[PDB]
Design a protein around this ligand. Structure first.
Ligand SMILES: Nc1nc2c(ncn2[C@@H]2O[C@H](COP(=O)(O)OP(=O)(O)OP(=O)(O)O)[C@@H](O)[C@H]2O)c(=O)[nH]1
Ligand SMILES: Nc1nc2c(ncn2[C@@H]2O[C@H](COP(=O)(O)OP(=O)(O)OP(=O)(O)O)[C@@H](O)[C@H]2O)c(=O)[nH]1
Ligand SMILES: *P(=O)(O)OC[C@@H]1C[C@@H](O)[C@H](n2ccc(=O)[nH]c2=O)O1
Ligand SMILES: [Mg+2]
Ligand SMILES: [Mg+2]
Ligand SMILES: [Mg+2]
Ligand SMILES: [Zn+2]
Ligand SMILES: [Zn+2]
Lengths: 73, 186, 929, 187
RNA sequence: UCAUGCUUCGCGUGGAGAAUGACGUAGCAUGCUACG
RNA sequence: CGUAGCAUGCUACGUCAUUCUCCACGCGAAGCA
């Protein structure tokens, strides 16, 4: 519904980040892992969505990694 | 199961027997007909096993080739197939903050650090044009991720501090874009 | 107050110390205290109500109440004279409480009174009982003892769980604040025994006749003998006291100069490894009148009972010596003229010093077997490595084998979106639904393996009640009498999968297949013969698991080197197979749940108990927290099948190899070597079968503690009262094994305490009336045993009870039980958590497994596991199985379409249609085959 | 099979039977010739069964000998590899310190755990946070295991060089912990 | 990138048994011809 | 009644060919505890 869509999306977001070689930055990878695991173990949806905002900011920060215009066409 | 030469004999031989019972001829004729029919049936049933084995081997080969091709295709396009899935699912969620930040990123207004969640929050964002600046900023309040932030410092593209009064309609060309804006969560 | 005040004045007794009646003047005071009792009628270690003593509390000049009590008792006129005489004999000993004997007029005639002066409120028996029968629901004696001696403050216990060893590891410091008092008590006991021996007195010492200052009183059962032939009896005293010595770290002062806690530590010689003289000195200092021979080195022991007896004392005494002196002992040999450094012995914490019997100085050439032995040896690897100081763990770090530290992460799972979309379209995952996703792949960062390894901080040195353990082991060996074991040849061994890792350093040259092919059967037999005279230390690798879970933990398993596994198989596999091939026993390894096996197992555990109730548990972090003594016990129980193929020396060296390989060996974690404190290495050859031995050992201990702490005077049945009396005798008064009583006690347990054991999982069917009357163990007895013998607090989330047998155990091997009609009769079926099956469908560990068209047989197994959910009263549970069948059909349709598109030939497979119909899966739970 | 002479007898019998059938013989000769054909075919099949059995037996031993010859090669390879690994580690250890400490042993035996402590020339320290660094390896020289160690390198969890000036309480949040410190035994 | 247990699926080798077809040797029974 | 010749019916053994049921191992893929 809505709480199951957030967790399945966080899994895929962390998979995408792991392909962009974020593990090379230990400090950033630790934060991403913490956000992902805290979303998986969540009971309230507002907490999950705020953590998703935080986790997606990681992808949007590294601008050259992906092009949003083609992906959001 | 026709199309085999052996069958073309067997059936024909069988035909004789089908007629033979009607004739009711001497016993020896019946026995020789039975022998011929059994020989033809044995030939056909020995030849059918060969075609069955060939068909099973062909099916095995087809399945293995399909599996190898599909595995290679799945592994090859793993990076491109995941970003599309991610953005499809993000569109499905249709959240407000997520849509806000993605629409901003499409215009180049991207964050420099991880968007914090606490009141004592440090945010740094890049504003690459005046239109986007006026769309997101008005006075000393910054709207991003469906929250409100207080602007602290607006560093020019050459690291020189910019006063919020300078950024206006006619000073878009004078300043060096993109600007970097520092804000604290309100 | 004429009568009640002139009594207090005389009780003062020329000491003139501020007395204040605790009671009501001249009347007796009632207390509820722990006693160690054995007479013709009763025997046990329980709490009794005593009403024979008046108590007066002493106070200070400032009118403050202090911990000094005058205890005045009245008794017969003959006991009065007897005690007076014995006291006059022992008066001068400084370990004797000061007595005063007088006579007072109570009503109209003289009554003789014996007054013991300046005693503590509680005794040593109270402390031992409080710590060995711990109940967080009511621990008032324990709290008062902790607060009276400045171990902690009264507001310490307002913390949510101050008692848990894992949630509050600071409780160990509070308990360690009691060590010096217990050490002083031991010293005074030795003084008292010397006084008895020199004065010529014979008697039994009990914990309840000594206070917490270490002073002794009573003397009512002491006989008089020749003035040099006294005989103290100290067996139950020491044995009951033993578990508290390692919990309070009593002997810590032995690490200081002059055994003084204010002086600095001792600085030992760094090259010293033989502490036999120190061990003997410690034994003579504390356990002087313990009258069974102590062997500091267990290579000199007479049997496995002797090995346990002396390894217990070694465990105690090893806490005083530097940690750098334990482990492999190395020596310089010459091979063809070049010098090597190789292991020629081993210093164990429990077994003492061991030396190899085949050490070849000045060799000429190494064959394949010698190369294998020298390569697996940690000596060469550690000698040439760098020094390491890892501050991320309290574990002892040996060396770094590289110039870099390795950090390894755990990746997330792969999302199978097609199955998730299908399930959603079928009506799953809606808000407010009983079936929701709970099992995921949790990702970890680069400090994961080291953290899971550091969880070994929960393993602590634990000294046991040796007299209790020596009976429990004999009873535990009765559950393993239907099996057959012994050594096999190298060509009789069965290796299930040869494509596994061979361990460090062998994993850099090939798999286990490489080494099983390179070695001939003669080489393997030569290696096995070698391990019966020599010790081969081994390096173990720590490998992270990648599995789906509902918890955030990341588990590590132990990859043991092939040198250890190859010989351990040849030593244990026959008994392992015999256990795994048996039906109807307590251990249910090797029994399938399909084709009616679950129903058979439940009907076998139910047996014919009288007032049945079910209970069960699951150990928390079983391998990290397991004591070393119990692991050695489990290893010794399994080797009792080698009474004809091996001698005592061979069996000791097999034990030493196992200990040096999977109990305290070197561990490689990220390119660095650490020393494992203890526990079990999950990944050795006997892990699942040693877990079962440990489990039933803990259960038998719980039952013994339940029966021996019951008031014997209030047992109605004469059979059970006689059983308790005999149990106490066989534990603390009998030295040799009594086989008849072991048979009797085993039959009692089988009749009233039926068990079903699988590794660290247990289901018990027990007689509720006996358990309520204290005749068999309960869940609380089990919790007490685990607290004082395992160093873990078991919470109510890891244990369960069930008063209705028609609904089966709550859980067992992650399965729930359902009583359903199957044809004509009712049977028990296992079903899983629906979330587990759905999560396995949705999240996978490989990208190619997200294409179901390549993995149709993957979903058939999940549907097999999910079939029993169709018979659940909840409808979503039933819908999971139908969802899986429909998805299987959809996958086959898609596969046929793809075959006809890519190629142009139809597959012609009219056999798969059985996989999306429920008959194929119903046949898997019917007793037909 | 074709090579085996029994095929010749079978072919001769079949040819004789066919010729007699074409010649329209009386009947008894035809019966004798069909008997000859039957017995010849039976004998030929009996021998062909043995021929196929021998073929399979011969074909199933080449695999065995190839497997054994390859296993011997792999055994030699692993033997050489283990020997080379053992001999390389011989020269990676400083002989003087080891000899000095192992001659002071009363019987030649020493604990293993004290070898790197007293003999190793390089020390590696893994520091998880700043307080541990302050209490453990502060400055360019520290003391450990009754020896003096001079710091020669510091890197972070990403294997990037870190300068000793960057290691301060306020700058700690900007570092990727843990830090790995490499030092050499002084004097 | 471990130890164990159970289960499903596919391929192969072999042993035992079941059914069917062709052919052979021997034994018994019945029918016809030549001779003693 | 015996010798020789031919025809049919039945029994025993042997030999291969074809299909099917169970089992013992071998090899590969997967699931669960
Ligand atoms: N130290 C101590 N013990 C006490 C006190 N009050 C009661 N007791 C108990 O009473 C006992 C003292 O009396 P004992 O001399 O041991 O007499 P007993 O062993 O009860 O002997 P009987 O009663 O004759 O069977 C101790 O063992 C304690 O358990 C007290 O204030 N201090
Ligand atoms: N060798 C090996 N042993 C395992 C594995 N999984 C479980 N075990 C053994 O089974 C024992 C009990 O397993 P669990 O109850 O899951 O694990 P645990 O360590 O007790 O952890 P919790 O009970 O969940 O706190 C463990 O201690 C292991 O020894 C495995 O994958 N490999
Ligand atoms: P399930 O509830 O996963 O575990 C039940 C029991 C615990 C453990 O001793 C044993 N087990 C489980 C999983 C595994 O891979 N190995 C293993 O020995 O079964
Ligand atoms: Mg007493
Ligand atoms: Mg457990
Ligand atoms: Mg378990
Ligand atoms: Zn001994
Ligand atoms: Zn043996």
């Amino acid at each position: 519904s809505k709480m199951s869509d957030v967790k399945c999306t966080s899994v895929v977001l962390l998979s995408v980040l792991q392909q962009l070689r974020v593990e090379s930055s230990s400090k950033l990878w630790a934060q991403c892992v913490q956000l992902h695991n805290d979303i998986l173990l969540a009971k309230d949806t507002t907490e999950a969505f705020e953590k998703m905002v935080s986790l997606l900011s990681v992808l949007l920060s590294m601008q050259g990694a992906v092009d949003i215009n083609k992906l959001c066409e | 199961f026709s199309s085999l030469p052996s069958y073309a004999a067997f059936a024909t031989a069988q035909e004789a027997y089908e007629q033979a019972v009607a004739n009711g001829d001497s016993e020896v004729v019946l026995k020789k007909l039975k022998k011929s029919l059994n020989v033809a049936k044995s030939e056909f049933d020995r030849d059918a096993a060969m075609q069955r084995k060939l068909e099973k081997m062909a099916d095995q080969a087809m399945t293995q080739m399909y599996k190898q091709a599909r595995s290679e295709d799945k592994r090859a396009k793993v990076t491109s197939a995941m970003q599309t899935m991610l953005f499809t699912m993000l569109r499905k969620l249709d959240n407000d903050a997520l849509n806000n930040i993605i629409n901003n990123a499409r215009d180049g207004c991207v964050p420099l650090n991880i968007i914090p969640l606490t009141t004592a929050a440090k945010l740094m964002v890049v504003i690459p044009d005046y239109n986007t600046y006026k769309n997101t900023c008005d006075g000393t309040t910054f709207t991003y991720a469906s929250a409100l932030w207080e602007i602290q410092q607006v560093v020019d593209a050459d690291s020189k501090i910019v006063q919020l009064s300078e950024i206006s309609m006619d000073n878009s060309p004078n300043l060096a874009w993109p600007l970097i804006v520092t804000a604290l969560r309100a | 107050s004429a009568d009640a005040q002139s009594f207090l004045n005389r009780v003062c007794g020329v000491s003139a110390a501020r007395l204040t009646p605790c009671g009501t003047g001249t009347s007796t005071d009632v207390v509820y205290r722990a006693f160690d009792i054995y007479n013709d009628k009763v025997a046990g270690f329980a709490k009794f109500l005593k009403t024979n003593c008046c108590r007066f509390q002493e106070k200070d000049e400032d009118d403050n109440l202090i911990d000094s009590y005058f205890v005045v008792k009245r008794h017969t006129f003959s006991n009065y004279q007897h005690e007076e005489t014995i006291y006059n004999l022992l008066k001068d000993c400084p370990a004797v409480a000061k007595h005063d004997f007088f006579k007072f007029r109570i009503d109209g005639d003289m009554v003789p009174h014996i007054s013991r002066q300046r005693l503590t409120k509680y005794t040593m028996a109270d402390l031992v009982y409080a710590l060995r029968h711990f109940d967080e629901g009511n621990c008032d004696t324990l709290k008062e003892i902790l607060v009276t001696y400045n171990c902690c403050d009264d507001d310490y216990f307002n913390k949510k769980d101050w008692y848990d060893f894992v949630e509050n590891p600071d409780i160990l410091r509070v308990y360690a604040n009691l060590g010096e008092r217990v050490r002083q008590a031991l010293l005074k006991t030795v003084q008292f025994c010397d006084a008895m021996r020199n004065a010529g007195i014979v008697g039994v010492l009990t914990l309840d006749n000594q206070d917490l200052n270490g002073n002794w009183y009573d003397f009512g059962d002491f006989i008089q003998t020749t003035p040099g032939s006294g005989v103290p009896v100290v067996d139950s005293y020491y044995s009951l006291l033993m578990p508290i010595l390692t919990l309070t770290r009593a002997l810590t002062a032995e690490s200081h100069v002059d055994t003084d806690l204010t002086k600095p530590y001792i600085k030992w010689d760094l090259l010293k490894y033989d502490f036999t003289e120190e061990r003997l000195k410690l034994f003579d200092r504390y356990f002087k009148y313990w009258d069974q021979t102590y062997h500091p080195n267990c290579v000199n022991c007479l049997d496995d009972r002797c090995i346990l007896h002396c390894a217990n004392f070694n465990v105690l005494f090893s806490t005083v010596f530097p940690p750098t002196s334990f482990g492999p002992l190395v020596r310089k040999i010459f091979v063809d003229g070049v010098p090597f450094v190789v292991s020629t012995g081993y210093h164990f914490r429990e077994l003492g010093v061991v030396h190899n019997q085949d050490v070849n100085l000045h060799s000429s050439r190494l064959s394949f077997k010698e190369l294998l032995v020298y390569a697996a040896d940690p000596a060469m690897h550690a000698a040439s490595g760098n020094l390491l100081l890892d501050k991320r763990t309290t574990c002892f770090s040996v060396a770094a084998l590289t110039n870099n530290v390795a950090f390894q992460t755990v990746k997330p799972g792969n999302f199978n979106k097609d199955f998730y979309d299908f399930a959603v379209s079928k009506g799953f995952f809606k808000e407010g639904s009983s079936v929701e996703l709970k099992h995921f792949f949790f990702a970890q960062d680069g400090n994961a393996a080291i953290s899971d390894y550091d969880y070994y901080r929960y393993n602590l040195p634990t000294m046991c009640d040796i007299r209790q353990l020596l009976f429990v082991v004999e009873v535990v060996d009765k559950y393993f009498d239907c099996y057959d074991g012994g050594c096999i040849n190298a060509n009789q061994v069965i290796v299930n999968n040869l494509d596994k890792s061979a361990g460090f350093p062998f994993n850099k040259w090939g798999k286990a297949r490489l080494y099983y092919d390179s070695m001939s059967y003669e080489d393997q037999d030569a290696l096995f013969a070698y391990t019966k005279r020599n010790v081969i230390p081994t390096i173990t690798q720590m490998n992270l698991k990648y599995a789906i879970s509902a918890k955030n933990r990341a588990r590590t398993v132990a990859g043991v080197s092939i040198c250890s596994t190859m010989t351990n198989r040849q030593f244990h596999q026959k008994l392992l197979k015999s256990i795994a091939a048996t039906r109807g026993a307590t251990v249910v390894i090797g029994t399938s749940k399909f084709y009616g096996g679950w129903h058979n197992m439940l009907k076998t555990v139910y047996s014919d108990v009288e007032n049945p109730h079910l209970m069960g548990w699951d150990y928390p972090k079983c391998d990290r927290a397991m004591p070393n003594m119990l692991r050695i016990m489990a290893s010794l129980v399994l080797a009792r099948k080698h009474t004809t193929c091996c001698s005592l020396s061979h069996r000791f060296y097999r034990l030493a190899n196992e200990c040096a390989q999977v109990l305290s060996e070197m561990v490689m974690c990220g390119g660095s070597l650490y020393v494992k404190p203890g526990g079990t290495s999950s990944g050795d050859a006997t892990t699942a079968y040693a877990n079962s031995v440990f489990n039933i050992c803990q259960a038998v201990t719980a039952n013994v503690n339940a029966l021996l702490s019951t008031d014997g005077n209030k047992i109605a049945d004469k059979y059970v009262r006689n059983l308790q009396h005999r149990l106490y005798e066989c534990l603390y008064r009998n030295r040799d094994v009594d086989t008849d009583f072991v048979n009797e006690f085993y039959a009692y347990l089988r009749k009233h305490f039926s068990m079903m054991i699988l590794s660290d999982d247990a289901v018990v069917c027990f007689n509720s009336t006996y358990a309520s009357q204290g005749l068999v163990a309960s869940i609380k007895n089990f919790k007490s045993v685990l607290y004082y013998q395992n160093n873990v607090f078991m919470s109510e989330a890891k244990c369960w009870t069930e008063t209705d047998l028609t609904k089966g155990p709550h859980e067992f091997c992650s399965q729930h039980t359902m009583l359903v009609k199957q044809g004509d009769d009712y049977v028990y079926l296992p079903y899983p958590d629906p979330s587990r099956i759905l999560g396995a469908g949705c999240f996978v560990d490989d990208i190619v497994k997200t294409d179901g068209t390549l993995m149709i047989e993957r979903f058939v197994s999940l549907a097999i596991d999910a079939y029993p959910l169709t018979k659940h009263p909840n409808q979503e549970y039933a819908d999971v199985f139908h969802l899986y069948l429909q998805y299987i059909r959809k996958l086959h349709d898609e596969l046929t379409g793809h075959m006809l598109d890519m190629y142009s030939v139809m597959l012609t497979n009219d056999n798969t249609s059985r996989y999306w119909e429920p008959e194929f899966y119903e046949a898997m739970y019917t007793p037909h085959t």
